[PDB]
């Protein structure tokens, strides 16, 4: 927990890599009544779409237009998620190797493949808790790594 | 004193549509379709015209039309009360109909190349209930309807949605999903697929030989098996003693030969001729597919049995190819069907005794590919002792090297290829033979 | 442990063509009127607005018959539905004064004071017709209460979870906004760690209470409100009957402008409030202008 | 130059740019069709035939100087460009019912691209093409376009149009007399619907980056292209690249930030120059349904008359049989007897249908036994890649469930569906089983029915039915031990029950002998390939498809005499050597094999009459395959001094 919010490098072996899918960052809407464009920000894993217009004109007039999604204008990012495991020479005597999660965005996708030994530069950031409710005591959080630069030993 | 519900029934349309040709531009029209029936449910009452009581005032509103859903009144009739949402149901003074659900499947000859069969749910009302049995080929005339479907939430594409128009409302949120699947509601159900000739048949004093020579005409020779199959299609007598001991009256046959012999053509003949027959193979069949399986209704509150090969051959002949590739688990069920005529089900808390009064036609390969004439019959077969004991006739097909027989056989085989079906000229036809068998089974010697 | 997402906009296309009874078109027509309308060769209202902003009087006095020769439609609407149009006419003045201050170098809503010289209904000629409509009245003042304090900007906090928010009021004519009854932290599931702080305490749901909002007074702003009573001229009264009177309400830049004993002309809206009979309401007038015949020196 | 916002398109610009090209198009060049006004014949013949779909190849436009711009614009903004292209047609048609009929275009030559998984999010709303094998398709789904509302206080009926998926339900009755709040009810069966189907495709790209396991894709086909694809088909598809947000669960209106991907299909191609045409004998009713549905997906290829003249010019050649056998595998130095069997397997026997029920099919089954270190493996691969439908199986890598059928959970609908197996996917094609001798007795059990009746019977939980498996079997087996031993009989060299060996039409003993001029020729053959007459692939496949499509051979009495004589002669041989399993005992399946091979040889050379030469050639081939010209009928041994290359 001392390492959250820092720039750190890791050494491990890649066990699984996910495909490339779009991740929405800002959604775009078009109102037929006013002709403005509404931009909604998303930073969760689930969001709720807007229904009514939030433009100045529609906000003033009683008649408020209805929103529709325009796929092309939206803000999209390329997303991949990787699992990294300990090397044999780092595990203590008698214990089992542990794992960690890595995130990749932008033009850094499709650079890690399963079975590679790498050194990854990332930013260590927290995420909301995903365990059992009955076992929750306080404001517990999960950790993930945000990739910035990849090195391969071979 | 209530009014009598009336139902209209159309039939004898120009064309019959295949299941794999139903489109969505025929929704809400009259059409006729074909299929094979697998599963039926029990008869349950259905809400048709209901009575409601107001909760603000106590007034009575009667004869509300439901139309496929649980509709409620939208306005108190009293010019004073302004109730539009709060109602209670009098289940004592409401009018019901009878309701059953049937499951159908595509026919074997109508399936395209490389694809699997399709299914469809059929709704029956009123007096049309309980006319379709499992394992039947029926034609349905009715109306093509749509019902809600929540399984489509996840499929790719744009899924239509509903909302209320806020242009026009004075001011100083109810989105519903339009997902549906195609279902069928039926009004007519029909199951599809003179004495002068019968009394002419009974007289002829060579009728037995003609009947023998009319069976499996495509196969050459092997008259013993032809006689056995006829005797198996005719049957014996069922008797009961004072002590409740049941004397069995079905004949069970086994044909033994190696992969070279023409033993599967006999089975294919019987599955094409006899009224209630099923063809199953050793390694493409599971135990549940022979005895029975239990599934739960979406409607809730009950369960349903789905028939297997042995239940679909009740009072009939079940055909099993490659009997030697059967498991001990399957053979213990076959033995139960042979000594008793019952199948016992105990799974998921359901107990049920079912009837399997069926005859067994089975083809078995010798244990080592070929038949050893120096061993006994038991040494050549791979069956459990209880199963072997209850078989009546064992027919073994062995090969002989004789020149004249080979000439005749080759002539026959080539004739069939050259002359198509003008190479048989049997004494009797299939439609003739079915009628005689039906007549013969009603005598008690 | 993430932050608050935002919503923002920008103009792109021409929407549907504009209906003339649209609110924005009303605001634009009234803003054109302010900087265009001429009498002689002097642009009276722009000069007036500039001068008033120099001396910190956030108000504009409009003679009502100057508009029945410029745009009769917006005049009919104002005399027919005053409560809906006055807030709209109060946006244009602020928008204009905003530009004036920025080019001539925290501005509240501007007050519109109406002054008129036209028909005068007597105080006994008031009926059900004139309700939600503009009337012109004459009389004598006999009462003036003490100034009361009313809020315009409120900052609040929840005594259980410590959630903060704000409230803005620009409608002081009723005599209403109230404090929220439930904590708004739950309905604004805003942060990803906020909906997680809302849970815990073994198995239960965060319950803040029935009404948990406290007002932080040093962070709030207020205005003044007064009550007056007008009486019919004591001379043209029915013989042997007590004179009748009406209750009037005023605020902001209209307070302390008169004293009892003065004969005045009032322009206002005839409205009601609830205070024997199946369904009876009490009338009162919202002040929009004051003009005194002559004062006692 | 009005520009549509968010694009670089000018509608008038592109319409006028398109109508000049459509009224004037240019292009080893002819003077009959290569130098004539092209597309006005295409339009005129379309309107004459009574047709509604124009099929528009793409690279046509990357040459003509004007419309180059339009190619880039079509590969970037398919939505806006295709509405411009239709108004050109219905304007051009009357320029030449045509005031109430709708026209469509279907691009089918978009190229480049390197697979679905190489596409980035910046390729959304773009036009791409795909190739692969179909596995599943859901039944038709009704999609709503126009809705029906009834006023429950006044019985006034209203209709509404879907606008980008959303339906606007009126709040107030429209009647000036009955003006109620919330009186509108929806009647589902009075609404207008349209067709939707979902396909699952196993993508087969050209570039496979290091370590890509196969995956599956979802395709949405609407209206006309319904039931135009069946499982087992190898297709080429053009469509748009989309994305959609999904709801987390049924109860909540909440969505998931990670999007879901699919393809909107516009054109479908079910032909290839380098592969054979499907068997029309198995799709008779689909052809009838396509005409009733007015979908112009073309299944068989077009034959011009110059090419058909070439067909008979070559069919007249004296050395047709050698030439055809030689051009089958032009890079496998091997005996022509082996290749002739593959050639006759491709043609297949005559399929016969009885009118009292009872089907006889003409599928040929071949076994390739012999030493290892031979070119058997290449033959199976080459035949896999020339036949339209096929699956390649290993010996110890198959299960009965994996060959017949199985039940699976769909990750989209979360329900249980039925899926096809290896042998059912091979209906009307070739199935290649490698290392047949290494396969279990449980898995070998299922092949008996497919080799006898060409069906499968399944009695499992949920399905009780009979399936069609009209497939050809091509199998290769490894001899016991290091090499084939001429001193032992054949039944002792192959680990397969002798009764099973008699189910195959042809059995090929591939033997290795050390001989100096054969070795020299093979070495020169192989070395010539690492440097820098026969019929090319296109013409071979075209000829075979023509023959398989039109002609149908029927046997004569002169052939019957020889067939019976040959069968009796074959049986009489080795009559004493039957108790001891030295040689393969003859059965009736050998008679049927002679019938089938005579019919196939007749079909080759384009006859409708099987004469005596065909039966003599068939018997010659059957004996030559088993090497009966060097076998001692008493001991079962082969004299290798007599086995010549
Ligand atoms: Zn708007
Ligand atoms: Zn009531
Ligand atoms: Zn709180
Ligand atoms: Zn109405």
Numbering used by the authors:
A (entry chain 7): 232 to 385
B (entry chain 6): 258 to 429, 443 to 463, 512 to 763
C (entry chain D): 2 to 106, 131 to 200, 204 to 303, 319 to 340
D (entry chain 4): 177 to 203, 215 to 283, 295 to 730, 740 to 852
Give the article text:
During the G1 phase, a pair of hexameric MCM helicases is loaded at each replication origin around double-stranded DNA in the form of a head-to-head MCM-DH. To determine whether Orc2∆N can promote MO formation in the context of origins with two high-affinity ORC binding sites, we performed cryo-EM on early time-point (2 min) MCM loading reactions with either WT ORC or ORC containing Orc2∆N using the 90 bp synthetic origin. Although MO particles were amongst the most abundant single hexamer (SH)-containing particles with WT ORC, they were not detected with Orc2∆N, even though similar numbers of DHs were detected, consistent with the biochemical data. Approximately 3 Å resolution structures of DHs, formed with WT ORC and Orc2∆N, appear identical. Moreover, DHs formed on the 90 bp origin with Orc2∆N are fully competent to support replication with purified proteins. Therefore, Orc2∆N cannot form MO, even on a template with two high-affinity sites, but can load functional DHs very efficiently. To ensure that this loaded MCM was functional, we tested its ability to support DNA replication in vitro with purified proteins. Although pre-phosphorylated ORC did not support replication from an ARS1-containing template (compare lanes 2 and 3 in Fig. 3c), it supported replication from a template containing the 90 bp origin almost as well as unphosphorylated ORC (lanes 4 and 5), indicating that the DH formed is functional. Consistent with this idea, a 2.8 Å resolution cryo-EM structure of DH assembled with phosphorylated ORC is virtually identical to DH assembled with unphosphorylated ORC.
